[PDB]
Amino acid sequence: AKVSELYDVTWEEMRDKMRKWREENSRNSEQIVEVGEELINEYASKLGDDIWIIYEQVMIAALDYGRDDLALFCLQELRRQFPGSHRVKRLTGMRFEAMERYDDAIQLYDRILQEDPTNTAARKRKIAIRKAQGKNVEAIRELNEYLEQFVGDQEAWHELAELYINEHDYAKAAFCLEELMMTNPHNHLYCQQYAEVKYTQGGLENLELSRKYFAQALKLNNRNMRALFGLYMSASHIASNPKASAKTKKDNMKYASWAASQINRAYQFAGRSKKETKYSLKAVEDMLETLQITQS
Amino acid sequence: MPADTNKAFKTEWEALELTDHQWALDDVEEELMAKDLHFEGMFKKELQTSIF
Amino acid sequence: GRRFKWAIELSGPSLYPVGYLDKQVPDTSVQETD
Amino acid sequence: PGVKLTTQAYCKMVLHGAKYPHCAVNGLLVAEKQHHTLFVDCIPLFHGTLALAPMLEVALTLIDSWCKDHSYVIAGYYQANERVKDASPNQVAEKVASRIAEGFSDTALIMVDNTKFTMDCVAPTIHVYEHHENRWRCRDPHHDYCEDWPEAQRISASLLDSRSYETLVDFDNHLDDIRNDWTNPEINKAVLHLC
């Protein structure tokens, strides 16, 4: 398939596909490297501005995959064009941290900070270095300090939330995801994650809030089945708890029953695609019937 | 750039108090009584694409 | 409860967080219309 | 009590770990209930943050719905850490182990190592922990949990060498792509054909 894929392709399509890969910031270091050196040896003619980012992405992938030879091959080419550039320095420090002798990359980062006071990338890389070197608490402390000093980066917020997830600290993660949802209210993914975190916390009021935020993101996109599953489970759990009002129990039961019919039909019209989908349909049908007998 | 931090801070401080709160999440009943048919015209056009 | 059978439960054991406040500080009520 | 698993389940576990080598992987082994513990096959649960129970709620409930359809039973749950220098079970893993041990009387926790995880595997590269409701946490030093070590090595080498492990699907992919199943049909056909 390698030669077959290499036959029915043009360089323009390769470059467009890699640009889309960079836009989606996916992890396909194997495929990024596989197409990387190919356009480097086949075309190697024009698109220097593109080929600089191409080189950087290729060596980023090679650092992950298996190959430092191509990493240095792209580093020397990047250094040839730009003699003084902080991006090349950051990439070299990343590779150094990958190999050995983390402290050298460290003082490289302090020299970078001494030259340019405003360098978020170097501080982020130092934070990631101490994330894996020592405990996560110190890394959280430095991330909080940097987030105080900038209060600009959403990636920092999401990284702090992810780090707090491992510590079973959903109280602070709730604030983090609320802040992240502030800037992007149309992103249903953050809403789903926030409802997930709130449901994990527990409590009837948290259950109701999580259910309502599950329902909000359900109408924004109409693409996700995770949110509807979470909503149905929240309704079932609020039905289970004795500390509730009668009418709220009836309406939550109605919500769960409607979600059950939505599940049934979604699996139903998926059955015409293949012939093995009937077994999944009957599996989910018995699942929903058992939970319906449980609820009723 | 301009160095009028004090008056800007005071203006923002009073403007923030002037804002009210209206939770837009309470209006959940609108979605419950509705129809879900986009999720299968959408689902029909997701099936043809294969895996590279 | 036993009705759900599988029930995974998760428990949780300097003020650096930016906005997360230890004290709740409710009792805000502003009615200004000029 | 001895522990024994079919090379199909081990291949599925290894390939699921290979699919996402950067984030933690999760799996569920399945046995047959009608002293040695025989494993039939494993299903991959999730990947990524791997600290969320309500998604595990739906996953485990659908797993039960499938076990009461083909007359199966859930034996144990396996989890691999992200960092290479980490071979200690986590709190969520122990919670799931206790949840499964409430029903079944034999649940072994399988930790997948990362230090001895290369192309040419030696053989076992598996940590078996035996946990209960009390403070009994013992790891078996070394035994034999697979039937045909040379043949299993050959199939694993063939599966890893040929880039045909992208067809492996997860429960999360099932939610994202309803088209994709989660029983790994192609994997089963491949392991049957290789033998």
From Swiss-Prot, chain A:
Changing residue 60 to K: No effect on transmembrane domain binding of tail-anchored proteins. InterPro entries: EMC2-like, TPR-like_helical_dom_sf, TPR_EMC2, TPR_rpt. One of its GO terms (cellular component) is extrinsic component of endoplasmic reticulum membrane. Belongs to the EMC2 family. It is found in: Endoplasmic reticulum membrane. Keywords: Acetylation, Endoplasmic reticulum, Membrane, Repeat, TPR repeat, Ubl conjugation. It is a peripheral membrane protein. The modification N6-acetyllysine is found at residue 254. PROSITE patterns: TPR, TPR_REGION. Ubiquitinated when soluble in the cytoplasm, leading to its degradation by the proteasome. Interaction with EMC2 prevents its ubiquitination and degradation. The keyword Acetylation applies. This is ER membrane protein complex subunit 2. It comes from Homo sapiens. Part of the endoplasmic reticulum membrane protein complex (EMC) that enables the energy-independent insertion into endoplasmic reticulum membranes of newly synthesized membrane proteins. Preferentially accommodates proteins with transmembrane domains that are weakly hydrophobic or contain destabilizing features such as charged and aromatic residues. Involved in the cotranslational insertion of multi-pass membrane proteins in which stop-transfer membrane-anchor sequences become ER membrane spanning helices.
Swiss-Prot record, chain B:
Coiled coil: none annotated. It is found in: Endoplasmic reticulum membrane. Residues 1-52 are cytoplasmic. Part of the endoplasmic reticulum membrane protein complex (EMC) that enables the energy-independent insertion into endoplasmic reticulum membranes of newly synthesized membrane proteins. Preferentially accommodates proteins with transmembrane domains that are weakly hydrophobic or contain destabilizing features such as charged and aromatic residues. Involved in the cotranslational insertion of multi-pass membrane proteins in which stop-transfer membrane-anchor sequences become ER membrane spanning helices. Belongs to the EMC3 family. Component of the ER membrane protein complex (EMC). This is ER membrane protein complex subunit 3. The gene is EMC3.
Swiss-Prot record, chain C:
Disulfide bonds: none annotated. It is found in: Endoplasmic reticulum membrane. Isoform 1 is expressed in brain and heart. Isoform 2 is expressed in heart. It comes from the Eukaryota. Belongs to the EMC4 family. Part of the endoplasmic reticulum membrane protein complex (EMC) that enables the energy-independent insertion into endoplasmic reticulum membranes of newly synthesized membrane proteins. Preferentially accommodates proteins with transmembrane domains that are weakly hydrophobic or contain destabilizing features such as charged and aromatic residues. Involved in the cotranslational insertion of multi-pass membrane proteins in which stop-transfer membrane-anchor sequences become ER membrane spanning helices. Component of the ER membrane protein complex (EMC). This is ER membrane protein complex subunit 4. It comes from Homo sapiens. The gene is EMC4. The chain holds residues 12 to 61 of 183 of the full protein.
Curated annotation (Swiss-Prot), chain D:
Coiled coil: none annotated. Its main location: endoplasmic reticulum. Keywords: Endoplasmic reticulum, Membrane. One of its GO terms (cellular component) is Golgi apparatus. It is a peripheral membrane protein. Component of the ER membrane protein complex (EMC). EMC8 and EMC9 are mutually exclusive subunits of the EMC complex. PANTHER family: ER MEMBRANE PROTEIN COMPLEX, ER MEMBRANE PROTEIN COMPLEX SUBUNIT 8. This is ER membrane protein complex subunit 8. The lineage of its organism: Eukaryota, Metazoa, Chordata, Craniata, Vertebrata.
